[PDB]
């Protein structure tokens, strides 16, 4: 929607090395704001954005209690799954869970999410109706029965529709300055000769937020979608992103190429060209 909140859980068993590890990170759109790792010196919830630091001790203690408990719940879960699949207690396994809520235009719940994966593959997920499940295989159905008998769906719906949205709105307020302002990218085109016959024109989009962006190389207005090489959007390390689109062109004809840039933090799409210095 206009804004989203997600929590990413990773529980991994490690036979011989120690008891299972549990990591949880929280995101409001493309910004991480909290982290918990049951392996850190002191297993506790830590802030990852400046705006979440303005919350009192109660908040932190609350998160830490939930996570410490979760760490135990997941250890039991791993053991349960291992049993379902007839797996040796000698192999490492991973359970990943993701959930969150999407805020609509009216400030209310747009969509709720809850998906689980075992060893990289879909295990069970909450359906869009927020009242039914979709189990991947017969083992996931064992879990489905437990969760149905324990009415987990009702509990989750309550959370996604209430607590999730309520808190998302608080975070969006506390961090209004950075979470609700779209940072446009600083752009520029570079020229790199590969041989005396051809050269690479690389179009850069740096320091933008959110990550969503579209870079396109055009020759005489014609989109060169087929010849363009794009790198995956990557983090700059300061809560902004980077990305570049390259195209190989013949020496001299470079004057016929223009870079098209699309990002929500821009009034309209940008159109650049390489300028010889």
């Amino acid at each position: 929607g206009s804004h989203s909140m997600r929590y990413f859980y990773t529980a991994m068993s490690r036979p011989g090395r120690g008891e299972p590890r549990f990591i949880a990170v929280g995101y409001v759109d493309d910004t991480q704001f909290v982290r918990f790792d049951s392996d850190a010196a002191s297993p506790r919830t830590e802030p990852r954005a400046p705006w979440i630091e303005q919350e009192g001790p109660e908040y932190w203690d609350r998160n830490t209690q939930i996570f410490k408990t979760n760490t135990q719940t997941y250890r039991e879960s791993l053991r349960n799954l291992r049993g379902y699949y007839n797996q040796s207690e000698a192999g490492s396994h991973i359970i990943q869970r993701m959930y969150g809520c999407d805020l609509g235009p009216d400030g209310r719940l747009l969509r709720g999410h809850d998906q689980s994966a075992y060893d990289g593959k879909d295990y069970i997920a909450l359906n869009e109706d927020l009242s039914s499940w979709t189990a991947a295989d017969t083992a996931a159905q064992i879990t489905q029965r437990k969760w149905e008998a324990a009415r987990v769906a009702e509990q989750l719906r309550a959370y996604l529709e209430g607590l999730c949205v309520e808190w998302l709105r608080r975070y969006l307020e506390n961090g209004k300055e950075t979470l609700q302002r779209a940072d446009p990218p600083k752009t520029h085109v570079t020229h790199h000769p590969v041989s005396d016959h051809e050269a690479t024109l690389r179009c850069w989009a740096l320091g933008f937020y959110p990550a969503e962006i579209t870079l396109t190389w055009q020759r005489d207005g014609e989109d060169q979608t087929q010849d363009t090489e794009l790198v995956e959007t990557r983090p700059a390390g300061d809560r902004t992103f980077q990305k570049w689109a390259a195209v190989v062109v013949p020496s001299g004809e470079e004057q016929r190429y223009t870079c098209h840039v699309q990002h929500e933090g821009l009034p309209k799409p940008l159109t650049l060209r390489w300028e010889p210095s």
Binding site: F67, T73, Y74, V152, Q155, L156
Partner: peptide, 9 residues
């Protein structure tokens, strides 16, 4: 704020 995960798989 996350939900209390009380029911195992």
């Amino acid at each position: 704020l996350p939900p209390l995960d009380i029911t195992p798989y």
